[PDB]
Design a protein around this nucleic acid. Structure first.
Ligand SMILES: *[PH](O)(O)OCCCOc1cccc2c(OCCCOP(=O)(O)OCCCOc3cccc4c(O)cccc34)cccc12
Ligand SMILES: *C[C@@](*)(O)[C@H](CCCNC(N)=[NH2+])NC(=O)[C@@H]1CCCN1C(=O)[C@H](N)Cc1ccccc1
Ligand SMILES: [K+]
Ligand code: NA
Lengths: 249, 27
DNA sequence: GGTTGGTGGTTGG
DNA sequence: GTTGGTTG
């Protein structure tokens, strides 16, 4: 995260870290949505253009963490993936469309002060909250500049209207993606960066004081550039696939 | 059905340093 | 101690 | 359809 700040303990208890086994490495952010299911960006697991292919064996899911590097005794839980599920219409070729993947864990996790599921939006939750000017919250352990923070970072960014998104990049935008960040003339800044992918863009419902994941960190061009905005998988637009996959498996 | 309420925050009526920025944005 | 027990450890200072 | 070539 660029131009963010240390997360307080338990401020983002759904935050998950995707951990490569060999070599031991942080790959990506993810998020907890139930005791058994975790959500992340497709490109984290599969990106041929950089020769990226990870399956169940290659990966660990770490939950309840705050310190990036250190093991956290009696705070953090570690799970292994039973089955990954990339979205079938995920376009790694052009524009990372439907950059989303689900992961079912072998063993369900016990909840605690530090590990707790986020809500996924419904029709109206999306409708009312996903709107130009409303700020959301991005978290992760990615890069502090176009990096390596010691502790989970946090930043709040305003959702941006489509026209400004589309006109900010020559990459073809879709409606499975939204963009967020401060405009050039706003004095505040901040962005996700390389390493933050898979992390949630969350919003607090003023209706029921609950947190909803509206977004997944997907991409951008550099980090924290005036005129550029980070892009997020539109979680709701893909809600049906999510429910679909949960129901079945 | 317990989702989205933080044990150390909402569940204890405490607020994090910045959540006020979010709610305030909805004006 | 700590977001956590009793010279690092599935781990810094 | 876990689904509107990047893939069988
Ligand atoms: P970063 O840059 O902070 O580097 C780390 C330096 C600080 O080192 C420690 C700080 C606190 C605790 C410990 C430690 O604790 C394990 C044992 C808990 O206490 P004890 O009962 O075993 O220790 C008995 C008393 C010894 O106290 C001291 C010994 C030497 C020096 C000092 C000192 O300068 C001030 C106060 C006490 C003592 C283990 C190792 C390091 C640290
Ligand atoms: C995988 C994630 O860690 C990372 C998140 C980047 C966040 N970006 C900002 N500044 N908001 N994503 C990436 O690295 C993605 C995946 C592949 C390359 N990539 C990019 O963002 C490219 N810089 C741009 C891009 C390339 C191809 C298709 C779409 C976008
Ligand atoms: K210790
Ligand atoms: Na910007």
């Amino acid at each position: 995260i660029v131009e963010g700040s240390d997360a307080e303990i338990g401020m983002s208890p759904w935050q998950v870290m995707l951990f490569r086994k060999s070599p031991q490495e942080l790959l990506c952010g993810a998020s907890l949505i139930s005791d058994r299911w975790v959500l992340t960006a497709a490109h984290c697991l599969l990106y041929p253009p950089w020769d990226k292919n990870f399956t169940e064996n290659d990966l660990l899911v770490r939950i309840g963490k705050h310190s990036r590097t250190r093991y956290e005794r009696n705070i953090e839980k570690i799970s292994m993936l039973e089955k990954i599920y990339i979205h079938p219409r995920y376009n790694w070729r052009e524009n990372l469309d439907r950059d989303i993947a689900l992961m079912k864990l072998k063993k369900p996790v016990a909840f605690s002060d530090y590990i707790h599921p986020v809500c996924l939006p419904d029709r109206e939750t999306a409708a009312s909250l996903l709107q130009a000017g409303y700020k959301g919250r991005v978290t992760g352990w990615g890069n502090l500049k176009e990096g390596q923070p010691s502790v989970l970072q946090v930043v709040n960014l305003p959702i941006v209207e489509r026209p400004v998104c589309k006109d900010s990049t020559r990459i073809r935008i879709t409606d499975n993606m939204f963009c967020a960040g401060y405009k050039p003339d706003e004095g505040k800044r901040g962005d996700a960066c390389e390493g933050d992918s898979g992390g949630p863009f969350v919003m607090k419902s003023p209706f029921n004081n609950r947190w909803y994941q509206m977004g997944i960190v997907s991409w951008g061009e550099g980090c924290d550039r005036d005129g550029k905005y980070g892009f997020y998988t539109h979680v709701f637009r893909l809600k049906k696939w999510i429910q679909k996959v949960i129901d079945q498996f | 059905a317990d989702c989205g309420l933080r044990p150390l925050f909402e569940k204890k009526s405490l607020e994090d340093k910045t959540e006020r920025e979010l709610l305030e944005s909805y004006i």
